[PDB]
Write a protein that binds this ligand. Structure first.
Ligand SMILES: *[C@@H]1O[C@H](CO)[C@@H](O[C@@H]2O[C@H](CO)[C@@H](O[C@@H]3O[C@H](CO)[C@@H](O)[C@H](O)[C@@H]3O)[C@H](O)[C@H]2NC(C)=O)[C@H](O)[C@H]1NC(C)=O
Ligand SMILES: *[C@@H]1O[C@H](CO)[C@@H](O[C@@H]2O[C@H](CO)[C@@H](O)[C@H](O)[C@H]2NC(C)=O)[C@H](O)[C@H]1NC(C)=O
Lengths: 197, 190
């Protein structure tokens, strides 16, 4: 009747600036428990030095060694496992998906775009690829061309939706708003721009 | 600040042999650990595992005695306490063939032969010869095994027995990188 894992860590989805805990409890264990981050060790005891926002918590008595990450970051998006030494085995794979909202998304037309012309809304630095929705006052799906652009680090993307407008004496004074949301964002941010001929 | 003067390298070790992985880090005050396929490592509760070298000069080399197929893994001497990982160490643990024999029995009275090397890494090569190398006819065909690490090479020989070859011995040798000189099984034609 050796050591076992009552609960092993599972794949969790966390948004940026949030707290996460990975369920790792192993009964019949008095031995040291470690954590693996892409093949990297964390720390001995329940005090993880030289690491920011990393602290293992839970019941030391019940064999519970849950890792706690506060204020999640793009860096934390990785694979984890709470393996233990002293004749103990590893513990599953933990894919941490740290979702991040788009930043300062706007339409490449300025405050007002005076002029078969075009508009385009661009979402920047979001993972997963944020979705752009085009509408003046009611959804104008017609024309919207969603195109995803991968970023430097290859983890996040920059979706750009090119709109096929054809301005007239009507659309003048009429605002064209563009919202952009992702799994990190329930209700996307919007930029209000003014058309002109 | 702290660095790795020498990092572990991909090493080839034969079965039942001793290996050391070079890991020396200057200007270090942190504890140094080792990684085996994303697993942490005087290594208790484990046999033949002992890290050695000079703690004073910063040398932390890993020592493995009596190598085995299980030890075939990826390693790195990463350190805790604000320290980084250290390269990748692909340890190739070579193993000799086991019980290689000819599927003809002690004596095999348009016939065929085949010598079969079993459970060797890398795939052992079979060489056919009565008294001098008779590569002609030998058909080497490698067969991978369940765990996909080792193989079972089988060389089928295209013989055609006659009144001459009787009493004449047919030996079959099988060698690999783990075996400089392969073992041979002697069979009698009839
Ligand atoms: C004696 O050993 C020789 C050498 O292996 C055997 O000759 C082999 O005969 C088989 C047919 O029975 C050939 O297999 C064929 O391969 C093709 C693929 O290229 C496949 O599509 C066919 O359906 C067929 O299976 C094989 O090529 C041939 N070997 C050589 C080197 O020519 C012979 O069968 C053995 N005899 C005995 C009694 O064991
Ligand atoms: C307005 O936006 C549309 C949408 O992309 C652009 O149309 C593209 O035109 C090029 C030809 O130069 C094609 O290769 C692309 O396939 C077209 N896109 C689509 C979705 O069909 C058009 O170029 C833009 N006009 C501008 C920016 O002045």
């Amino acid at each position: 009747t050796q050591t076992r894992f009552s609960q092993e860590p599972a794949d969790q989805t966390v948004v940026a600036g949030q707290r996460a805990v990975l369920p790792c409890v192993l009964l019949n264990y008095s031995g040291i428990v470690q954590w693996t981050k892409d093949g990297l060790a964390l720390g001995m005891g329940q005090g993880l030095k030289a690491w920011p926002r990393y602290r293992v918590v839970g019941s030391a008595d019940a064999g519970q060694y849950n890792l706690e990450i506060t204020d999640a970051e793009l860096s934390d998006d990785a694979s984890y496992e709470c393996q233990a030494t002293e004749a103990a085995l590893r513990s599953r794979r933990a894919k941490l998906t740290v979702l991040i909202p788009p930043e300062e998304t706007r339409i490449d037309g300025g405050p007002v775009i005076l002029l078969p012309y075009n508009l385009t809304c661009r979402a920047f630095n979001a993972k997963p690829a944020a979705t752009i929705i085009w509408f003046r006052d009611g959804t104008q799906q017609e024309g919207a061309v969603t195109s995803t652009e991968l970023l430097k680090d290859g983890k996040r993307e920059t979706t750009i939706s090119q709109l096929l407008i054809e301005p007239t004496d009507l659309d003048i004074g009429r605002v064209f708003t563009c919202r952009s949301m992702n799994e990190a964002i329930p209700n996307g941010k919007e930029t209000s721009i003014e058309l002109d001929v």
